[PDB]
Amino acid sequence: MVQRGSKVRILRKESYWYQEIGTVASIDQSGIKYPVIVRFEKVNYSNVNSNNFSLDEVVEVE
């Protein structure tokens, strides 16, 4: 289980941040899919820093 304030790696292979370190922001503790809001140090192409990931998509490098 992943809680807020953790450092992750990325298995979403369709992303820009794929296999990069993200420090998460929040989990939506209701049933809406892809709830892991992961802030990153690096910014993407279209200038966003955070993204919804799945709990099956984030890791626990800690």
Partner 1 sequence: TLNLNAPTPIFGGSTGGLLRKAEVEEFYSITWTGKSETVFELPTGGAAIMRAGENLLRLARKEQCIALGAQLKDKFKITDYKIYRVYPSGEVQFLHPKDGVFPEKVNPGRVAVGSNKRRIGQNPDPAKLKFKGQETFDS
Partner 2 sequence: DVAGLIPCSQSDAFERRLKNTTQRLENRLKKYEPGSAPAEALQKQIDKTQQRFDKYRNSGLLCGADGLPHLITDGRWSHAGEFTIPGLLFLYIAGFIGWSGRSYLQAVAASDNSTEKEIIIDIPVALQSVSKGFVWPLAALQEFSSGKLTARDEEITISPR
Partner 3 sequence: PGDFLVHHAIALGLHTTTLILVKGALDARGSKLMPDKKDFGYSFPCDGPGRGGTCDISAWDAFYLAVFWMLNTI
Instruction: Name which of 21 and 37 has its Cβ closer to partner 2.
Output: 21
Residue type, 2: V
**Which residue stretch of 9-17, 24-32, 35-43, 52-60 sits at the interface with partner 3 (rule: CB under 8 A)?**
9-17
Exactly one of 29, 30, 45, 62 binds partner 3 (CB under 8 A); that residue is 45
Q: Fill in the amino acid letter for 25.
A: A
User: How many other CB atoms are found less than 10 A from the CB of residue 49?
Assistant: 14
Closest CA to 51 of 29, 23, 19: 23
Residues lying near partner 3 in the complex (CB under 8 A): 13-16, 18, 45-46
